[PDB]
Design a binder for this molecule. Structure first.
Ligand SMILES: *[C@@H]1O[C@H](CO)[C@@H](O[C@@H]2O[C@H](CO)[C@@H](O[C@@H]3O[C@H](CO[C@H]4O[C@H](CO)[C@@H](O)[C@H](O[C@H]5O[C@H](CO)[C@@H](O)[C@H](O)[C@@H]5O[C@H]5O[C@H](CO)[C@@H](O)[C@H](O)[C@@H]5O)[C@@H]4O)[C@@H](O)[C@H](O[C@H]4O[C@H](CO)[C@@H](O)[C@H](O)[C@@H]4O[C@H]4O[C@H](CO)[C@@H](O)[C@H](O)[C@@H]4O)[C@@H]3O)[C@H](O)[C@H]2NC(C)=O)[C@H](O)[C@H]1NC(C)=O
Ligand SMILES: Cn1c(C(=O)NC2CS(=O)(=O)C2)cnc1COc1cc(Cl)c(C#N)cc1C(C)(C)C
Ligand SMILES: [Ca+2]
Ligand SMILES: [Ca+2]
Ligand SMILES: [Cl-]
Ligand SMILES: [Cl-]
Ligand SMILES: [K+]
Ligand code: NA
Ligand SMILES: [Zn+2]
Length: 804
């Protein structure tokens, strides 16, 4: 109950929320049924529209007008945005030449350049080129400022997840807004876009920019705009706030447009009806820039033009129905559409079985347009699991499709021709970034980056210390003229041991055999040299990874590879090797098929053993440095050391062997050599973070050998592929993956076929950033290169997406 019979006189769009049941005049007032009686009359004026005309110039102020063309309007801060153009012979901002903004050019009393975030819903990356002819203001921002070819959203590629990631620098799993609808079992409550539920603070985790700003003495405008406030009035409201006195004036502002998403849903991304919404957004940008120019702020304010997600072609007829797969279809609740999430109708149902639901959804139809996953099995690059609001069963829906429970759900609740929410690597989901202003670079292209990075930059732009987030601070320094954040490499926590030969063969009782007894003085000194690190400059190109937690580990050198061998996990944390373009692939000789060799540098008590793998009927083993890429028959013996062995499901060994036997050499040939770092990952609680050993849920039967949840590889080469990987003078090129270590290949529908037909496709789905691997391993890579640390941070954030 509000008492809506106070007044908004002189409080229109007040910045501090006065508290119920005083009546409100800020702009959530609408969403709470709490506006003062006179809010519309006083705060939402519309008379005479939004543009000065020649006849209004010098008018007598009339306070009923929506905006003013009277002589006193600039000092009152409420002219129509085109006032100077119409009434003072000025040029529209868009008609002026691009002029570099080397320093902020701010009115007196401005302590720092303001930041305006101009967010556009559903603005697909390719609109920048395809609509260029009708968006002159946006094209000027883009060509004059700093821009990327596109910006990668987070998954799911929906509005609230992406805008709140923008505001927090957090993955949806961490901020809590994991979809446009959710259930929180702990709260026992449901969240929807409609409804008033979404306004409860309990949903919204992390620390959004406006709170970061306010805690550190920087004032913010509103970020949420009521749907009934027209765009022209949101712009005027921002410009009015910008004429407040210095002690009252915000430094950060946001403007939000429901378009072009709104029309894209109706008309598809490139429907003829989409030209007009693009024109209208551009005109709104024009109003802001002309309003800034009137206030002498157009060379003072940093503007960020950013989208939340793109838009794909999606129709009613491209819908998969769970009722075509399950019989029990009425025992589930599906969160439907461009993703699926499944849980039980009743938690009083003890008969509900995830495993049978998954099996009933797996490769059941030959052209099936969705794939089921337990959420812990989703590609780690989605970071979509560590939240109670994300249901254990997930469906990744093919682009251009929907999933629904039953057909009646689609015609008792055709219309739409566009939608979004797919995998965030999908081209049609990519969105836009432009930064324009004194702090951004001039006429600069930057590579595509992820929207989780922007929070740190926005904090830099405003002199704020960012709250802890998923960005990599420094990775976007290259966007900025000044206000760079000069990151420093994290300190190594554990220093390695460098063991020599300390154990006689007979001290080992591992139940291993190798056929390796086959006796020179030239070749005697050589082997010694290799075991002491003589080839290490070839195989370890970017220094040793730093271990950023407390543990016990050994560096082991070999002719063909170097490893960091964990005494706690009984296997390498990392294995590093370089494969030149000219390298030869060989087979595992017949006599060496089951060969495993004790490592006389490492104690029996810190070694794996062969017996465990023999007794474990489900578990086999593989090798991190592949025997197939041995430099010589003699070097090959090194690859069979027990210190190179790792636990692997037979089904996973199909993947791993094909990667090691065929793909590494392919990459070396295409990229002119590669450096490979491979190792295990343990993420049993699916939080994206290295497990401690007391979190491991599975071991090789009857042993203390932990079973990895995933295997990674980082594959680096020279960006200038005329230079070999091992003699690269300039920037690097990387691709990485985090393959799930699964006992079946049920994820791959074509896995009964030869590996040449499915393995590479799996690996692409599980592409990863180096930084993803860093979080999962507590390692820090690229410690010793020629390159600046900011560049390396950019490289560590790169994702190879394999889109056309
Ligand atoms: C992306 O970046 C983010 C942000 O940097 C990273 O997330 C951080 O990870 C940290 C490590 O996991 C984590 O730290 C823990 O937090 C506990 C304090 O928590 C509250 O306070 C903060 C600060 O204001 C707040 O942000 C938190 O927010 C969560 O809480 C609610 C969820 O209901 C939501 O409002 C919000 O969305 C957020 O949810 C998300 O995070 C939680 C976990 O915090 C998830 O469960 C959700 O799914 C969702 O993802 C909190 O309100 C602190 O209590 C923990 O301490 C334990 O462990 C330490 C080890 O040193 C030790 O001292 C103790 O043993 C202690 O153990 C005791 O508690 C145990 C666990 O309950 C118990 O089992 C023991 O036996 C003991 O009693 C811990 O420090 C930090 O909170 C999050 N921050 C955020 C915002 O998510 C994220 O990791 C990054 N992602 C990647 C991939 O890098
Ligand atoms: C998205 N949105 C809506 C909306 O969705 N309205 C419909 C749901 S309805 O049914 O109520 C009508 C209204 N205003 C906004 C803008 O919100 C933002 C803008 C930016 Cl720039 C950032 C950042 N950084 C963050 C946000 C929020 C979402 C975190 C507040
Ligand atoms: Ca949206
Ligand atoms: Ca973990
Ligand atoms: Cl916004
Ligand atoms: Cl959703
Ligand atoms: K076995
Ligand atoms: Na399969
Ligand atoms: Zn939409």
């Amino acid at each position: 109950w509000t008492a809506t019979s106070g007044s908004c006189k002189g409080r229109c769009f007040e910045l501090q929320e006065v508290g119920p049941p005083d009546c409100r005049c800020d702009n959530l007032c609408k969403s709470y049924s709490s506006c003062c009686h006179d809010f519309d009359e006083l705060c939402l004026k519309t008379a005479r529209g939004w543009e000065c005309t020649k006849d209004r110039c010098g008018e007598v102020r009339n306070e009923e007008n929506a905006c003013h063309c009277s002589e006193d309007c600039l000092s009152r801060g409420d002219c129509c945005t085109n006032y100077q153009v119409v009434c003072k012979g000025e040029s529209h901002w868009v008609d002026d030449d691009c002029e570099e903004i080397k320093v902020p050019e701010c009115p007196a009393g401005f302590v720092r350049p303001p930041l305006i975030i101009f967010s556009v819903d559903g603005f697909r990356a390719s609109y920048m080129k395809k609509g260029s002819k009708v968006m002159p203001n946006i094209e000027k921002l883009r060509s004059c400022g700093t821009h990327a070819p596109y910006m990668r959203p987070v998954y799911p590629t929906k509005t609230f997840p992406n805008l709140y990631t923008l505001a927090t620098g957090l993955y949806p799993e961490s901020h809590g807004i994991v979809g446009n609808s959710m259930y929180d079992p702990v709260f026992d409550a449901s969240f929807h876009l409609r409804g008033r539920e979404k306004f409860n603070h309990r949903w919204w985790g992390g620390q959004p920019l406006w709170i970061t700003a306010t805690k550190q003495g920087v004032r913010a405008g509103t970020f949420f705009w009521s749907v009934s406030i027209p765009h022209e009035r949101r712009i005027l409201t921002i410009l009015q706030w910008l004429s407040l006195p210095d002690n009252e004036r915000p430094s950060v502002y946001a403007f939000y447009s429901e378009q072009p998403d709104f029309s894209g849903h109706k008309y598809g991304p490139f429907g003829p009806e989409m030209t007009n919404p693009l024109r209208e957004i551009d005109k709104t940008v024009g109003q802001l820039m002309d309003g800034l120019k009137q206030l002498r702020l157009h060379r003072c304010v940093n503007v960020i033009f950013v989208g939340d997600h793109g838009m794909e072609d999606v129709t009613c007829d491209r819908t998969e129905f769970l009722s075509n797969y399950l019989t029990n279809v009425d025992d589930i609740t599906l969160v439907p559409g461009t993703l699926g999430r499944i849980r039980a109708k009743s938690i009083n149902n003890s008969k509900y079985d995830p495993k049978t639901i998954i099996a009933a959804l797996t490769c059941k139809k030959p052209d099936q347009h969705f794939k089921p996953y337990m959420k812990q099995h989703l590609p780690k690059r989605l970071h979509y699991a560590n939240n109670r609001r994300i249901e254990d069963i997930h469906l990744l829906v093919d682009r251009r499709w929907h999933v629904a429970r039953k057909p009646l759900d689609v015609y008792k609740k055709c219309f739409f021709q566009g939608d979004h929410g797919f995998d965030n690597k999908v081209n049609s989901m990519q969105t836009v970034f432009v930064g324009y202003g004194p702090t951004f670079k001039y006429r600069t292209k930057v590579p595509p980056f992820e929207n989780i990075e922007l929070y740190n930059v926005m904090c830099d732009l405003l002199g704020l210390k960012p709250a802890p987030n998923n960005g990599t601070h420094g990775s976007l320094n290259h966007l900025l003229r000044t206000n760079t954040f000069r990151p420093t490499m994290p300190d190594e926590v554990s220093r390695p041991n460098y063991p020599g030969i300390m154990y006689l063969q007979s001290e080992f009782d591992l139940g291993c055999t190798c056929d390796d007894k086959v006796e020179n003085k030239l070749e005697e000194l050589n082997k010694r040299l290799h075991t002491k690190g003589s080839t290490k400059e070839r195989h370890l190109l970017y220094g040793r990874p730093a271990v950023l937690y407390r543990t016990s580990y050994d560096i082991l050198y070999h002719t063909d590879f170097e490893s960091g061998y964990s005494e706690i996990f009984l296997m390498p944390l990392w294995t590093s090797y370089t494969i030149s373009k000219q390298a030869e692939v060989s087979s595992i000789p017949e006599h060496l098929t089951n060969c495993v060799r004790p490592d006389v540098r490492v104690s029996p008590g810190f070694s794996q053993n062969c017996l465990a793998y023999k007794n474990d009927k489900q578990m086999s083993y593989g090798f991190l440095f592949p025997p197939y890429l041995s430099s010589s028959p003699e070097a090959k013996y090194d690859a069979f050391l027990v210190t190179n062995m790792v636990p692997m499901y037979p089904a996973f060994k199909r993947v791993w062997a094909y990667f090691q036997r065929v793909l590494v050499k392919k990459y070396a040939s295409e990229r002119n050599g590669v450096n490979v770092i491979s190792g295990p990952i343990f993420d049993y609680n699916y939080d994206g973070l290295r497990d401690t050993e007391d979190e491991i849920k599975q071991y090789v039967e009857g042993s203390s050998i932990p079973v990895p949840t995933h295997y990674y590889s980082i594959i680096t080469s020279c960006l200038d592929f005329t230079q070999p990987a091992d003699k690269c003078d300039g920037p690097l090129s990387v691709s990485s993956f985090i393959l799930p270590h699964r006992p079946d290949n049920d994820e791959s529908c074509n896995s009964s076929e030869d590996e040449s037909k499915w393995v590479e496709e799996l690996m692409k789905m599980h592409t990863a950033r180096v930084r993803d691997i860093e979080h999962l391993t507590g390692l820090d890579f690229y410690r010793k290169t020629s390159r600046s640390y900011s560049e390396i941070l950019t490289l560590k954030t790169y994702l190879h997406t394999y889109e056309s």
